[PDB]
């Protein structure tokens, strides 16, 4: 595979409402355009977790435009998470924000759970959130 995070736009079956915008929001040059990059990619079932209006917002073409703006707080630089180091640390977003990262007692980031604790992406790092964690959206 090539593109890894960004190439999702090509397929996007599970991340069709989100990670398709990885390439298509102009994040392609960002995520695949360097090397190690870690993004909290929520699954199709995660949008079904908060389907009140968030999935509608994130289904609206409006969101990928602001994703262009807000990518930096959803994109974390190429650094290996607690699965390598130790659980119970703060991870910094490219925007410039430190979030809560702990696996012991429940893999939770900033108060949202990584219910499907993945990690090993092709170029970077993949973690499936069951919720959302960003400035506003």
PDB file of C-alpha atoms in Angstrom:
ATOM      1  CA  UNK A   1       0.000   0.000   0.000  1.00  0.00           C
ATOM      2  CA  UNK A   2       1.050   3.620  -0.516  1.00  0.00           C
ATOM      3  CA  UNK A   3      -0.405   6.687   1.165  1.00  0.00           C
ATOM      4  CA  UNK A   4      -1.424   4.702   4.213  1.00  0.00           C
ATOM      5  CA  UNK A   5      -3.525   7.209   6.115  1.00  0.00           C
ATOM      6  CA  UNK A   6      -4.223   9.478   3.165  1.00  0.00           C
ATOM      7  CA  UNK A   7      -4.831   6.751   0.575  1.00  0.00           C
ATOM      8  CA  UNK A   8      -8.038   5.948   2.436  1.00  0.00           C
ATOM      9  CA  UNK A   9      -9.833   8.429   0.113  1.00  0.00           C
ATOM     10  CA  UNK A  10      -9.253   5.836  -2.637  1.00  0.00           C
ATOM     11  CA  UNK A  11     -11.198   3.169  -0.778  1.00  0.00           C
ATOM     12  CA  UNK A  12     -12.859   4.452   2.392  1.00  0.00           C
ATOM     13  CA  UNK A  13     -15.270   1.747   3.425  1.00  0.00           C
ATOM     14  CA  UNK A  14     -14.868   2.037   7.164  1.00  0.00           C
ATOM     15  CA  UNK A  15     -13.418   5.548   7.209  1.00  0.00           C
ATOM     16  CA  UNK A  16     -15.601   6.743   4.393  1.00  0.00           C
ATOM     17  CA  UNK A  17     -17.128   9.551   6.430  1.00  0.00           C
ATOM     18  CA  UNK A  18     -13.758  10.698   7.816  1.00  0.00           C
ATOM     19  CA  UNK A  19     -10.428   9.408   6.522  1.00  0.00           C
ATOM     20  CA  UNK A  20     -11.431   9.783   2.882  1.00  0.00           C
ATOM     21  CA  UNK A  21     -10.907  13.445   3.692  1.00  0.00           C
ATOM     22  CA  UNK A  22      -7.344  12.669   4.778  1.00  0.00           C
ATOM     23  CA  UNK A  23      -6.182  12.788   1.179  1.00  0.00           C
ATOM     24  CA  UNK A  24      -9.046  14.914  -0.027  1.00  0.00           C
ATOM     25  CA  UNK A  25      -8.699  17.724   2.539  1.00  0.00           C
ATOM     26  CA  UNK A  26      -5.127  18.295   1.447  1.00  0.00           C
ATOM     27  CA  UNK A  27      -3.682  16.274   4.321  1.00  0.00           C
ATOM     28  CA  UNK A  28      -2.116  13.850   1.857  1.00  0.00           C
ATOM     29  CA  UNK A  29       1.037  15.932   1.524  1.00  0.00           C
ATOM     30  CA  UNK A  30       1.053  16.137   5.290  1.00  0.00           C
ATOM     31  CA  UNK A  31       0.477  12.586   6.529  1.00  0.00           C
ATOM     32  CA  UNK A  32       2.010  10.549   3.730  1.00  0.00           C
ATOM     33  CA  UNK A  33       4.265  13.359   2.601  1.00  0.00           C
ATOM     34  CA  UNK A  34       6.873  12.852   5.288  1.00  0.00           C
ATOM     35  CA  UNK A  35       6.817   9.690   7.348  1.00  0.00           C
ATOM     36  CA  UNK A  36       5.655   8.795  10.853  1.00  0.00           C
ATOM     37  CA  UNK A  37       2.262  10.318  11.574  1.00  0.00           C
ATOM     38  CA  UNK A  38      -0.393   9.279  14.030  1.00  0.00           C
ATOM     39  CA  UNK A  39      -4.068  10.142  13.625  1.00  0.00           C
ATOM     40  CA  UNK A  40      -7.088   9.121  15.676  1.00  0.00           C
ATOM     41  CA  UNK A  41      -9.172   7.559  12.951  1.00  0.00           C
ATOM     42  CA  UNK A  42     -12.649   6.703  14.273  1.00  0.00           C
ATOM     43  CA  UNK A  43     -14.439   3.698  12.848  1.00  0.00           C
ATOM     44  CA  UNK A  44     -17.789   3.646  11.035  1.00  0.00           C
ATOM     45  CA  UNK A  45     -19.257   2.356  14.296  1.00  0.00           C
ATOM     46  CA  UNK A  46     -17.784   5.378  16.097  1.00  0.00           C
ATOM     47  CA  UNK A  47     -19.942   7.798  14.143  1.00  0.00           C
ATOM     48  CA  UNK A  48     -22.788   5.501  15.126  1.00  0.00           C
ATOM     49  CA  UNK A  49     -21.671   6.015  18.719  1.00  0.00           C
ATOM     50  CA  UNK A  50     -22.500   9.718  18.554  1.00  0.00           C
ATOM     51  CA  UNK A  51     -25.063   9.798  15.705  1.00  0.00           C
ATOM     52  CA  UNK A  52     -27.194  12.539  17.266  1.00  0.00           C
ATOM     53  CA  UNK A  53     -25.783  15.292  15.087  1.00  0.00           C
ATOM     54  CA  UNK A  54     -22.022  14.780  15.005  1.00  0.00           C
ATOM     55  CA  UNK A  55     -22.149  12.176  12.290  1.00  0.00           C
ATOM     56  CA  UNK A  56     -24.367  14.566  10.386  1.00  0.00           C
ATOM     57  CA  UNK A  57     -21.835  17.367  10.906  1.00  0.00           C
ATOM     58  CA  UNK A  58     -19.018  15.023   9.923  1.00  0.00           C
ATOM     59  CA  UNK A  59     -21.106  13.815   6.990  1.00  0.00           C
ATOM     60  CA  UNK A  60     -21.650  17.382   5.782  1.00  0.00           C
ATOM     61  CA  UNK A  61     -19.126  18.573   3.129  1.00  0.00           C
ATOM     62  CA  UNK A  62     -18.563  21.518   5.465  1.00  0.00           C
ATOM     63  CA  UNK A  63     -16.470  19.503   7.910  1.00  0.00           C
ATOM     64  CA  UNK A  64     -13.667  18.442   5.546  1.00  0.00           C
ATOM     65  CA  UNK A  65     -13.111  22.121   4.766  1.00  0.00           C
ATOM     66  CA  UNK A  66     -12.570  22.864   8.432  1.00  0.00           C
ATOM     67  CA  UNK A  67     -10.547  19.644   8.700  1.00  0.00           C
ATOM     68  CA  UNK A  68      -8.162  21.439   6.361  1.00  0.00           C
ATOM     69  CA  UNK A  69      -7.865  24.067   9.095  1.00  0.00           C
ATOM     70  CA  UNK A  70      -8.068  21.828  12.119  1.00  0.00           C
ATOM     71  CA  UNK A  71      -5.917  18.902  10.939  1.00  0.00           C
ATOM     72  CA  UNK A  72      -3.095  19.938  13.256  1.00  0.00           C
ATOM     73  CA  UNK A  73      -4.964  18.964  16.458  1.00  0.00           C
ATOM     74  CA  UNK A  74      -6.023  15.630  14.975  1.00  0.00           C
ATOM     75  CA  UNK A  75      -2.629  14.933  13.476  1.00  0.00           C
ATOM     76  CA  UNK A  76       0.054  13.971  15.936  1.00  0.00           C
ATOM     77  CA  UNK A  77       3.739  13.969  14.824  1.00  0.00           C
ATOM     78  CA  UNK A  78       5.699  10.818  14.129  1.00  0.00           C
ATOM     79  CA  UNK A  79       6.382   9.654  17.625  1.00  0.00           C
ATOM     80  CA  UNK A  80       5.673   6.230  19.059  1.00  0.00           C
ATOM     81  CA  UNK A  81       2.961   5.997  21.697  1.00  0.00           C
ATOM     82  CA  UNK A  82       2.833   4.246  25.091  1.00  0.00           C
ATOM     83  CA  UNK A  83       2.688   0.816  23.378  1.00  0.00           C
ATOM     84  CA  UNK A  84       6.424   1.358  22.923  1.00  0.00           C
ATOM     85  CA  UNK A  85       7.353   3.593  25.803  1.00  0.00           C
ATOM     86  CA  UNK A  86       4.963   3.354  28.766  1.00  0.00           C
ATOM     87  CA  UNK A  87       1.267   3.958  29.383  1.00  0.00           C
ATOM     88  CA  UNK A  88       0.482   7.221  31.119  1.00  0.00           C
ATOM     89  CA  UNK A  89       1.951  10.072  29.106  1.00  0.00           C
ATOM     90  CA  UNK A  90       0.858  13.175  27.245  1.00  0.00           C
ATOM     91  CA  UNK A  91       1.024  13.225  23.491  1.00  0.00           C
ATOM     92  CA  UNK A  92       1.440  16.462  21.570  1.00  0.00           C
ATOM     93  CA  UNK A  93      -0.573  17.416  18.489  1.00  0.00           C
ATOM     94  CA  UNK A  94       1.040  19.264  15.555  1.00  0.00           C
ATOM     95  CA  UNK A  95      -1.276  22.175  16.391  1.00  0.00           C
ATOM     96  CA  UNK A  96       0.547  22.184  19.678  1.00  0.00           C
ATOM     97  CA  UNK A  97      -1.507  20.498  22.337  1.00  0.00           C
ATOM     98  CA  UNK A  98      -0.792  17.763  24.854  1.00  0.00           C
ATOM     99  CA  UNK A  99      -3.474  15.126  25.334  1.00  0.00           C
ATOM    100  CA  UNK A 100      -3.988  12.379  27.901  1.00  0.00           C
ATOM    101  CA  UNK A 101      -2.668   8.980  26.788  1.00  0.00           C
ATOM    102  CA  UNK A 102      -3.081   6.008  29.114  1.00  0.00           C
ATOM    103  CA  UNK A 103      -3.636   2.297  28.376  1.00  0.00           C
ATOM    104  CA  UNK A 104      -3.675   0.930  31.922  1.00  0.00           C
ATOM    105  CA  UNK A 105      -7.225   0.893  33.236  1.00  0.00           C
ATOM    106  CA  UNK A 106      -8.604   1.496  29.784  1.00  0.00           C
ATOM    107  CA  UNK A 107      -6.952   2.914  26.649  1.00  0.00           C
ATOM    108  CA  UNK A 108      -8.230   6.457  26.903  1.00  0.00           C
ATOM    109  CA  UNK A 109      -7.052   9.639  25.221  1.00  0.00           C
ATOM    110  CA  UNK A 110      -8.090  13.045  26.614  1.00  0.00           C
ATOM    111  CA  UNK A 111     -11.215  11.362  27.951  1.00  0.00           C
ATOM    112  CA  UNK A 112     -12.104   9.420  24.809  1.00  0.00           C
ATOM    113  CA  UNK A 113     -11.496   5.707  24.369  1.00  0.00           C
ATOM    114  CA  UNK A 114      -9.469   3.910  21.757  1.00  0.00           C
ATOM    115  CA  UNK A 115     -11.799   0.919  21.898  1.00  0.00           C
ATOM    116  CA  UNK A 116      -9.948  -0.686  19.025  1.00  0.00           C
ATOM    117  CA  UNK A 117      -6.310  -0.265  20.128  1.00  0.00           C
ATOM    118  CA  UNK A 118      -4.434  -0.463  16.867  1.00  0.00           C
ATOM    119  CA  UNK A 119      -1.084   1.269  16.263  1.00  0.00           C
ATOM    120  CA  UNK A 120       0.932   0.019  13.318  1.00  0.00           C
ATOM    121  CA  UNK A 121       0.192   2.015  10.172  1.00  0.00           C
ATOM    122  CA  UNK A 122       2.248   1.804   6.977  1.00  0.00           C
ATOM    123  CA  UNK A 123       3.793   5.263   7.187  1.00  0.00           C
ATOM    124  CA  UNK A 124       2.620   6.323  10.605  1.00  0.00           C
ATOM    125  CA  UNK A 125       0.434   5.170  13.463  1.00  0.00           C
ATOM    126  CA  UNK A 126      -3.257   4.230  13.519  1.00  0.00           C
ATOM    127  CA  UNK A 127      -5.655   4.321  16.484  1.00  0.00           C
ATOM    128  CA  UNK A 128      -9.427   3.917  16.278  1.00  0.00           C
ATOM    129  CA  UNK A 129     -11.363   6.197  18.529  1.00  0.00           C
ATOM    130  CA  UNK A 130     -15.011   5.565  19.346  1.00  0.00           C
ATOM    131  CA  UNK A 131     -15.539   9.266  19.838  1.00  0.00           C
ATOM    132  CA  UNK A 132     -14.206  12.683  18.878  1.00  0.00           C
ATOM    133  CA  UNK A 133     -11.340  14.766  20.307  1.00  0.00           C
ATOM    134  CA  UNK A 134     -10.585  18.066  18.577  1.00  0.00           C
ATOM    135  CA  UNK A 135     -10.959  21.881  19.233  1.00  0.00           C
ATOM    136  CA  UNK A 136     -14.622  22.101  18.395  1.00  0.00           C
ATOM    137  CA  UNK A 137     -14.739  19.942  15.337  1.00  0.00           C
TER     138      UNK A 137
END
